[PDB]
Symmetry: D2
C-alpha cells in the first residue's frame, strides 16, 4: 500500500503466508530492474555481487557499510511501491556500534531485511567468532530494529558448519532466535537431507536457503526447497554469473570478429524502458515539460 | 611503465601508432574486469551503462559528476598498470566551472580521456547548445588539462547531426579542434559513406567512431572503421546489452522452472579470479598473513 | 512520536501552531549536533555551507544531488527522533526528472522540507528562469511529494527580486502556491518594510525569511520577524561564519605562537559527547559488549 | 612543481630539511581552506574530525575507508599545487587486503602520507593487537606504496603505551621502521621528558608528535617539540575544537537573543573567497563565459 514499506511487505509474506519467498540475487540497477520486470515478489542483494560490480573486487570484506548501503538504497527504491529487498549485511562492518548503524541505515533506506553472519570481520564468500561474540552482533541488530519500531526482517546467518559442524550451527541459530532474529540461515548445506534436517530442527522458526549457483552446495530446486519447509530461498549468483558469461562471450566475439553480435531486440530504448524510462517520461510530461 | 598513467598510454597509442584503438563499453567492475581479462588495450566507460547499473535509471542526465567520477575512478584503477580508460563526461555536468571540475576529477582519478558533448544540460542518449556555448565547454576542459600538465585525451563530441545537419557537425568539430580538443566524435552517423566523409573532412585530426549496439546507426565492423580512417572506436552497449539479455533469460528460467541453469564453469571462484582474487591473495600472503 | 518523521513534525509546527519556526543553518555533523544539543526545534541545511564544508568550494552550483542528499541524510538522521530538517535543494539539480528525483531522495532520507528556487541551473549564492520554467520545477516537486504520500514541506524560493523586481516575486510565489508549494521564500529583501509587505501580500500562505549573516539583506531579529508574520526563519550562515572566524583566529595563533589555545573545557570527550558518544556507548553496552 | 605531488613535497621536507613540519588538524573544506589561506606548509586530516563533521559521530571506528578517502581526496586536492596532506588511516579498515587498498586509494588521491596504528579494528580516540599483527598491517602498507612507486610517507603509530608501556612502544616502532615505515608516532606521551626520550631512542629515524588540544597529553609548544628533535607535529583538534566553541556560543546567542552576532567582516563573499571563489571565476572568465 504505502511507499518504502518493503519491511512490512516482507514481514507480511513471512507471517501471513506459507509461500516459499523466492529472491533472485541482484547486484546493480540493471539486474534489479530485470528481476522487477519479471515480477519477482522479493529481491536479494548479494554482497559478493555488489563487491564485484560496484568495486571490481572479490568477496573479501572489501565492500563496507557505505558501498553496501548505497547499493541497497538504490535497489530497494527503484520503485517506492516495489518488491521488498533482502540485503547482505555481512558481519555488520564492525563491532556492535557498527552493526547497529548498519541496521539503522538499511532500515532508513527502505531495506526489508538483511542477513548477519558469524564470520570474523575479515570474512570471505572460513573462520567464525565465538557464539557469544556472534550474539553481540545479533543483539545489537535486534535492539536497533526495535528501537526504530521497524518490521525489518533480521536473518541470522551461520557460517559455522565448515569449521564447527552441524550441531554448533543449530545451537547458534537457536541462540540467535532467542535474541530476536526473525529467520535463520545455515550457510552451505552439504546435502539435501541435512537441509531438511535443519528446517525440522528449528521449526516452526523460518529458515532461508541460500542457493549459490555453481558453488559447493547441493543443487536444490524451488519445489524441493518448498517441500523441505524453507520459507525464503535466495539465489546469490543468479544474475552475476550469467552476466559474466554473456559479457565474456560477447567481448571474445568483438575481439576476434570485430562485431558485438547481441540479439537485435536488446536495444538501448528497451534497456531504458527496463530501467524506468516510462516513469521518467511521465514525470517530465506531467510537470508541464 | 608507471602506475596510473592511462592518459600517457592512450596518448601514446594515438600519437605514436596508426592502430584503430578498440574500446569495449564497460559499466561496472565485472564488465571492466572481463574486458581486462581478454586483453583489450583500452576501455570505454559508458554513461548510459553507468546510469543503468549504478542508479537503475535511463540515460536522461540523472547520473551526475559524483556517480560518473566514482565509476570511472573505480574502473580506471582496478589495475594501476592496466589499460587506459576513456570515460563519458556528458556535458561536463554544468557550466564551465563544472566542466573544469569534471576534467580535473577525471584526470586525478587516472582517467585517460573523456568525451564532452554539445547537448543541452538536460541531455539524453536531442537538442544542442549554440556553437559558442559548446566552445565554452571545450575551452574550460582544455584549459584544465593544460593547467594540470596532463596528457588527458579530450574528445569533442557533437550531437548536432540530428537537428542541425552534417555541415554544422563538421564546423563544430573544426572549432573544437582549434580550441584544443584532441579527437572528434560525430555522434550517430546515418551511413557508412557519411562516416568516411567526416574522417576525410577532418583529417589528419583523429576521429572516434561510437558504435551503439542495436541502436540507430549503421553497423560498422572494426575492419570497416579502420579502413575508413577512424583512430578510436568505442562500443557503447557492448556489455550492458548482453548482460541484460542473459540476466533476463536466466531469471525467466528461474521463475518458470525453479533453477538458474548457468553453465557450471562460471563458479564464484572464477568470478572472484576475474575480479582480482589473485592480487588480493598475494597482498595477504605477502603481508605475512 | 515515530522515528524519521521530520516531515510530519515540521508540518505539524506549521499547520498546528502560530510560532515562528527558528532554524539555525547547519552544514555538517558538528554544527548540526550543536544545534541539537541546544534544543532548536528545527534545523536548516545550507547549500553554501554544505559546499564549503563537504567540497571546499564556493556556492556556484558545484554541489549536486549526491553531495546535498548525502549531507541532508546524515544530518536529518543523527537522531531518528530529532528535530525536522529543512534542506536547500537549489534548483533541483536538473530538469523536472532531477527535481522529482531530488524530492524523492530527500523524502526517503527523512528530510522534512526543502526550498526550490527559480535560478538558472548555473546558479549562485543572479539570473532566473521564466515563470513557466520555474513552475515546471515546482510541479515536478509537488507531484513527487504527493505520489509518495509525504508531508514534505516544499518551500518555493524566488531569487527574482534582483533582476525582475518585487511584483514579479509576488506573482511567482502566488503561482507556486497554486501549484502546491507549502511555503514561500522571497530571497534577499531590501528593507524590513518590504519583508512585512510580502507577508501581507501572500497571507495567510506562510512565508519563510532567510537571514544571511553578514550578507546584503537588512538585519531582522527573531522578534521582528515574528511580528512581521513570518512562519519560518532560517539562518543561512549562522554556524559556517563563526566556525571560520574561530578556526582562522586559532590557526593564526598556532602559526605565530606555536600553541592552539582553545578554551580547555572543549575536550575531545566533550566533542564526542556532543556527537553522540552516549548513544554509542549505550549500543555497545546494551549489546552485551 | 608538478600537480598532485603532495607525497613528493612531504618527502622532500622530511629528507631534505631539518625543519619541524607543523600540520594543523583539519576536517572539512572550510578548515582546510583556512589552513591553506594562512600558509601552512602541510596539513593533517584528523579521523576524529572527519567522523564528527562528515558523519556527526564519535571517533569509534564509525568512519571507514570510503568516508576517510573521500574527505582526504577532497582536502588534498583543493589546490593541485597546494600543501601536502597527512591523513589518519586508522587501522587500515580491515585486514592486510584493506590496508593495501587504503594506502592505494590514499596514494591515488594525492595524499602525501598517513598514520597507521596498532589498535584493534574496533578502535577509539584502548587495546592493541599483537606486535606481529601490527607488522602485518605495516608490511601490507609498505609493499603497496612500493608497488605503486610512490613517495607516500607511512607513519607507524603505536597506541600501546597505555596498556603495554613505553618499552613495548619503542620496540614496535623499531620493528615498524625495519618493515619500511618512514616515521614513527608514539601516541599519547605522559610527559615531555618521555617525548624527548622516544625521539632519542629512535634517532635518527624521524618521529611525529601528535598534539591533542585539551586532551590528556602534556602541552608541548612548537618550539619545545622542535628542540626535542621531532620532525613532524600534528595538531589533531586544532580546528574542530574552536569551531565547536564558536558555533555553540553563536547558537546560544541566537537562541537567547534572536541574533547571530558574527563579526561583520566574515561575509559570505569572504567565505567564498577563502573557499576558492577566485579560481572559479578565473575558470569561468577564461572559458569565454
Ligand atoms: O554475498 C552473497 O551473495 C551471499 O552472502 O549469499
Ligand atoms: O553513454 C554512452 O554509452 C555514450 O555516450 O556512447
Ligand atoms: O545556501 C544557503 O545557505 C541558502 O540558500 O540560504
Ligand atoms: O583522529 C585524530 O585526530 C588522530 O588520530 O590524531
Ligand atoms: Ca545486434
Ligand atoms: Ca549451473
Ligand atoms: Ca586549550
Ligand atoms: Ca554580524
Ligand atoms: Mn555475502
Ligand atoms: Mn553518454
Ligand atoms: Mn543555497
Ligand atoms: Mn584518529
Amino acid at each position: 500500500d504505502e511507499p518504502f514499506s518493503g519491511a512490512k511487505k516482507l514481514r507480511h509474506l513471512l507471517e501471513n503466508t506459507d509461500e516459499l519467498i523466492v529472491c533472485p540475487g541482484v547486484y546493480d540497477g540493471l539486474s534489479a530492474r530485470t528481476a522487477m520486470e519479471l515480477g519477482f515478489k522479493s529481491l536479494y542483494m548479494t554482497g559478493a555481487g555488489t563487491t564485484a560490480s560496484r568495486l571490481g573486487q572479490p568477496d573479501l570484506a572489501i565492500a563496507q557499510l557505505h558501498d553496501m548501503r548505497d547499493n541497497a538504497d538504490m535497489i530497494a527504491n527503484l520503485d517506492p511501491f516495489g518488491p521488498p529487498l533482502i540485503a547482505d549485511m555481512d558481519t555488520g562492518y564492525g563491532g556492535p556500534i557498527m552493526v547497529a548503524r548498519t541496521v539503522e541505515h538499511y532500515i532508513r533506506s527502505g531495506v526489508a531485511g538483511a542477513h548477519l553472519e558469524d564470520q570474523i570481520l575479515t570474512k570471505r564468500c572460513k573462520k567464525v567468532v565465538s557464539r557469544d561474540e556472534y550474539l553481540v552482533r545479533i543483539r545489537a541488530a535486534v535492539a536497533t530494529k526495535r528501537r526504530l519500531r521497524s518490521d525489518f526482517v533480521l536473518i541470522a546467518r551461520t557460517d559455522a558448519l565448515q569449521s564447527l559442524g552441524y550441531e554448533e550451527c543449530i545451537e547458534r541459530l537457536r541462540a540467535a532466535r532467542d535474541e530476536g532474529a526473525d529467520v535463520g540461515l545455515l550457510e552451505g548445506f552439504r546435502s539435501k537431507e541435512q537441509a531438511a534436517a535443519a528446517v525440522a530442527a528449528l521449526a516452526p522458526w523460518p529458515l532461508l536457503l541460500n542457493s549459490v549457483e555453481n558453488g559447493h552446495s547441493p543443487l536444490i530446486t524451488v519445489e524441493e526447497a518448498k517441500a523441505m519447509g524453507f520459507r525464503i530461498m535466495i539465489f546469490s549468483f543468479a544474475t552475476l554469473a550469467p552476466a559474466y558469461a554473456a559479457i565474456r562471450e560477447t567481448l571474445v566475439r568483438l575481439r576476434d570478429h570485430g562485431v558485438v553480435g547481441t540479439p537485435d531486440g536488446i536495444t538501448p530504448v528497451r534497456l531504458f524502458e527496463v530501467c524506468g524510462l516510462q516513469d521518467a517520461m511521465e514525470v517530465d510530461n506531467g510537470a508541464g515539460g
